[PDB]
Every structure is written in structure tokens, then in C-alpha cells.
From a paper:
The crystal structure of AidH was determined at 1.29 Å resolution using single-wavelength anomalous dispersion (SAD) phasing. The crystal has the symmetry of space group P21 and contains two molecules per asymmetric unit. Size-exclusion chromatography and analytical ultracentrifugation data for AidH indicate that it is monomeric in solution. Therefore, the functional unit of the enzyme is a monomer and the dimeric organization on crystallization is likely to be an artifact of the crystal packing. The α/β-hydrolase fold core domain consists of an eight-stranded mostly parallel β-sheet (only the second β-strand, β2, is antiparallel to the rest) surrounded by seven α-­helices. The cap domain composed of five α-helices is inserted between strands β6 and α4 of the core domain. The whole active site is covered by the cap domain. (i) The structure of AidH shows that it possesses a conserved catalytic triad (Ser102, His248 and Glu219) and a recognizable substrate-binding tunnel. A hydrogen-bond network connects Ser102 to Glu219 via His248. No metal ion is bound in the active site, which is different from other AHL-lactonases, which have a dual Lewis acid catalysis mechanism.
Residue numbers in the entry: 2 to 276
The structure:
Amino acid sequence: TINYHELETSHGRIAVRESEGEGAPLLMIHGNSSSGAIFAPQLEGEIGKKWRVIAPDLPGHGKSTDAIDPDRSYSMEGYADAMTEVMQQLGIADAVVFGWSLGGHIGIEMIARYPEMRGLMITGTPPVAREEVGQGFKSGPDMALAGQEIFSERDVESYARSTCGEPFEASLLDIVARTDGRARRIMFEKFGSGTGGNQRDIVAEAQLPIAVVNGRDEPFVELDFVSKVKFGNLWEGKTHVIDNAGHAPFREAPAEFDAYLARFIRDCTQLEHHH
């Protein structure tokens, strides 16, 4: 079973889901207007059965409260601070981190804050400097929604369908509709303004293994750009692409995604470590 509990943090009350796996811990960080509940396939499947999968809800998302201070919390760096505080409270310093989309950007910001991170996998995330946003992302009809505060019952359906892919479930509406819209607006403005660390430079200089896994039919991320990004230590020496998946391969193509994630976790935690 999945163990659910809530943490009182400086950012607000944070909802946390944990699998019962006895193995090394994996923090999974959800995307913009999503929730850790999206990682059901990993929490409840083979990944969560073996490893201790931790899937919280960001402030303003899911079953977490809105941020005590939106100006502090709703940014890639603010979320990274919140997740670092969560891991401190959970007593876990050496998790492997998986970040989906916004969660991948948060994971990149966590590299400086969480130095014993054993690896970072990013999916739906182009590491970009602020001036590279146009190169790293695909312009499109749903792109503006990322930073749009007010969602109607539509501009909730469109967002949910494009970000989560097949299969669509009504429960996805509940998740997206709950999101504190201020979090979209403030995060987006701050990212475009470079209030946090330059993500291009961070991943180029990072020594920990970074894995990059995307769906081939990504509607938001330019895969050609991603395949050209410099990483200090790119896992298996290339960026990886899963056929018949878009923005959310961990739910669209779970067995194939899990092959990458399991192999990455094993490599980052179960191999002899040298320098």
C-alpha cells in the first residue's frame, strides 16, 4: 500500500506519498499544476515495490496547502528549497531524484541545495538559460497556459490532456483545477527573468549522473535542442527517447519508462563508487 502523510514545513503543509519499498530512496517531483498522485504507476508498481519512492505535492498543488508565502515558494528555486526541506524532515540526504517537467527544473535547482543527490533524471525538461526558452520549448496553442493564472473549466481540460497524454482520466481535472493559479504566473515570470541559477550552466558543470528521458512525440520540449545540451555526466552518454509517448512517458509508456528509471536507480545506488 501507499503510505500518505503530511509534513508541516516553513512553506506550508506538504502532502507526501511513499511506497513501501525497502531499497534506496527516489524522490519524484511532479510538474506544473500536477500532483505526486500522477506517479501512481511508479508508486504502486515494480519501482515502488523495490525502492522507497517519495512523491510529494508542491506547495499550491494537490493535497498540499497553498504556500504560506507565494513570493518565496512559487519559483523553480523556491520549490527546490521546499523539496530540500522536505527531504531534511524525512531524514534522507542521498535520494536519486526524478523530475517531470517543472519538476525537472526544480531538480536542477536542487543540485546546489542537495549535494549528496545520487543522480537526477529529467523528463519533459530542457535545461535552458533564460534567453534560450524559445529554443528549448515548442511554441504552441497550450504554451501560454504554463504561466496563466486563471484557468476556466476549459483551459483546464486542454492543459490536462496535453501535459498528461493518453490515457485521460477525469481525476486529472481535479488535480489541475485545484492548483493555486498564482503559482503558474509567479513561477513563469521568475523563470523568464532568471531569478534562479542558470540551468544550462548548472547541468554542464554538475558532476552527478544526469539522465534525460523523453517521449518522442513531446509537444512542449524541443528534443533536437535537448540532444545538444552539454551535461557534465550524461547517463549512458546520450539523451533517450521513448516511442509512442509525449510529455508524460512514465504514464503513457510505463514499462518502457520504468526500464530506464530502474536501470538509472541501480546504476546510481548499487554500483561500486570510485572517483
